[PDB]
């Protein structure tokens, strides 16, 4: 269990807006993930397997841990944070740092549709961090090159594959890319 803390994942943004807008208004916006941003857990093997299209952001309800709130997708719904093209760092916080096989990072394609549910064919692989089966917290932060050929509203998906289970944690990040 864990989530992307910087940039602020959508899941962690829900936990953050819990504090600023309260439990009910934040749960209306994000669903039950506000309490458990670390629990966006679904089957590993993305993109060939893993959570189905339209259930990527919620990891198909996080293995029963959350609802499907995160799967809403419109131009306006989610809080965007600014990021620049090029090298960026992605830092996870672990509540329970499991043995890790890899992390893998994707961005939305230049022509993606911000008002339809997320599908795996809107995402492009941008980097893979292999790991030696040790705990996730031996490599907290990853240096990933974000494409410099697109701008405006994009989603970075970070995926954390657990070494010793059939599961993975899916963290979408809403970004305004410049």
Query: Pick from 1, 10, 55, 154: which binds Cu ion (CB under 5 A)?
Result: 1
Closest contact distance (angstroms) between CB of 13 and Cu ion is 20
Closest contact distance (angstroms) between CB of 38 and Cu ion is 7
Using the contact rule CB under 5 A, the part of the chain among 45-53, 63-71, 91-99, 151-159 near Cu ion is 91-99
Closest contact distance (angstroms) between CB of 48 and Cu ion is 23
Residue 133's region, left for phi above 0, alpha for psi from -120 to 50, else beta, is: left
Query: Pick from 25, 79, 96, 125: which binds Cu ion (CB under 5 A)?
Result: 96
Query: Closest CB to Cu ion among 1 and 18?
Result: 1
The number of residues that bind Cu ion (CB under 5 A) is: 2
Closest contact distance (angstroms) between CB of 59 and Cu ion is 12
Query: Closest CB to Cu ion among 168 and 175?
Result: 168
Q: Is 166 in the site for Cu ion (CB under 5 A)?
A: no
Task: Find the residue with minimal CB distance to Cu ion.
Answer: 1
Residues in 141-160 that interact with Cu ion by CB under 5 A:
none
Query: Closest CB to Cu ion among 91 and 151?
Result: 91
Per-residue b/e over 95-113, b at no fewer than 16 CB within 10 Å?
eebbebbebbbbbbeeebe
The 3-state secondary structure of the chain reads CEEEEECCCHHHHHHHHHHHHCHHHHHHHHCHHHHCCCCCEEECCCCCCCCCCCCCCCHHHHCCCCCCHHHCCCCCCCCCEEECCEEEEEEEEECCCCEEEEEEEEEECCCCCCCCCCCHHHEEEEEEEECCCCEHHHCCEEEEEECCCCCEEEEEEEEEEECCCCEEEEEEEEEEEC
Using the contact rule CB under 5 A, the part of the chain among 80-88, 93-101, 131-139, 152-160 near Cu ion is 93-101
Note the residues at the interface with Cu ion (CB under 5 A): 1, 96
């Amino acid at each position: 269990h864990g989530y992307i803390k910087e940039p602020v994942s959508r899941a962690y943004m829900g936990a953050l807006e819990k504090q600023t807008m309260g439990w009910t208004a934040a749960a209306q916006k994000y669903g039950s993930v506000i309490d458990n941003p670390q629990s966006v857990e679904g089957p590993k093997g993305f993109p060939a397997a893993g959570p189905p299209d339209g259930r990527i952001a919620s990891a198909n309800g996080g293995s029963g841990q959350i609802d499907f709130g995160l799967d809403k997708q419109t131009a306006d719904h989610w809080v965007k944070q600014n990021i620049r093209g090029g090298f960026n760092t992605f830092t996870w916080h672990y509540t329970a740092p499991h043995a890790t096989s890899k992390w893998h990072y994707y961005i939305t394609k230049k022509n993606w549709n911000p008002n339809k549910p997320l599908s795996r064919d809107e995402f492009e692989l941008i980097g893979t961090v292999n790991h030696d089966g040790s705990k996730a917290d031996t490599n907290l932060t990853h240096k990933i090159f974000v494409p410099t050929d697109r701008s405006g509203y994009h989603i970075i998906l970070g995926v954390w594959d657990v070494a010793d289970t059939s599961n993975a944690f899916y963290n979408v990040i809403d970004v305004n890319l410049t």
